[PDB]
Amino acid sequence: GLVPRGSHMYAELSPGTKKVYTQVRYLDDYHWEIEGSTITGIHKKSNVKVVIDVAKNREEADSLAGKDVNGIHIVAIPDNGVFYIKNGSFVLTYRYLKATLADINDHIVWSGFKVVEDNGKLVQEDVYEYLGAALVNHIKNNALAGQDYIFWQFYKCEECGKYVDIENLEAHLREHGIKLHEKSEEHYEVFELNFREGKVFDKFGGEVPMDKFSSEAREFIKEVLS
Ligand SMILES: [Zn+2]
Known part of the structure; x- marks a missing residue:
C-alpha cells in the first residue's frame, strides 16, 4: 500500500531527483523525505534541518540560492566542479553531497x-x-x-x-x-x-x-x- 503507492510515486520522480537522493540516503544520521524536487533531511541527533533542492543547471541553482529554509539549504546540480556558497546556500555538484552532508554531520x-x-x-x-x-x-x-x-x-x-x-x-x-x-x-x-x-x-x-x-x-x- 504505502509500498506500491510508495514505489509508484518514487518511480515517477525525475531521474535527477532520484540520482541526488541516492547520494544521500545512506547517511542515516539524517531522516530523509522527498517532495517533488526537494529532498529534506533532519539530523536525527540534533534535529537540524537540511533542505536539498535539485536543479538542472547553475542558472536555476543561482535563482534558488535565495531561499530561507530554517536550516541548511543546499542546491544540488549535475554540473561538475561546482562548489560555492551563495546567499547562504551551498550550490554544488551533486557528487559532493555525500561528503558535504557528512562534513555537516561532523x-x-x-x-x-x-x-x-x-x-x-x-x-x-x-x-x-x-x-x-x-x-x-x-x-x-x-x-x-x-x-x-x-x-x-x-x-x-x-x-x-x-x-x-x-x-x-x-x-x-x-x-x-x-x-x-x-x-x-x-x-x-x-x-x-x-x-x-x-x-x-x-x-x-x-x-x-x-x-x-x-x-x-x-x-x-x-x-x-x-
Ligand atoms: Zn577548577
Whole structure:
C-alpha cells in the first residue's frame, strides 16, 4: 500500500531527483523525505534541518540560492566542479553531497544538556551547535574530522577558570569539593584538537594557548595530539 503507492510515486520522480537522493540516503544520521524536487533531511541527533533542492543547471541553482529554509539549504546540480556558497546556500555538484552532508554531520556538535520537568518526569534536553564557520574552514583545508582533527568538549571551571576536558571534569570538580552528579545542567566549549598542528583551536579557527587548560587537560591534549 504505502509500498506500491510508495514505489509508484518514487518511480515517477525525475531521474535527477532520484540520482541526488541516492547520494544521500545512506547517511542515516539524517531522516530523509522527498517532495517533488526537494529532498529534506533532519539530523536525527540534533534535529537540524537540511533542505536539498535539485536543479538542472547553475542558472536555476543561482535563482534558488535565495531561499530561507530554517536550516541548511543546499542546491544540488549535475554540473561538475561546482562548489560555492551563495546567499547562504551551498550550490554544488551533486557528487559532493555525500561528503558535504557528512562534513555537516561532523560539525553538529553536542555542547551540553539541561534536565527539565515534563509531565511529572525529568527529561534531558541536549544542546547542539552547528559550527558553520569551522565547517567552511575545514572544507577549504580539506580537513576531515577524525583524521586531521577532532572536536572535543571542555568545561570552563567556575572555580579556577581553567579548561578541563569533559572526562577529567568529574575528578577536577571533586578536588574543589563539588559533586558533578549533583549538577543538572552544564555547557562546554567545543575546541578543535588538530593532529597536523599539534595545537588547539577554538570553534572559529583561532588558536588557544595551552595555559588555558588545567594541568589535567594539558596532558590529555598532549596524549590526544600524539
Ligand atoms: Zn577548577
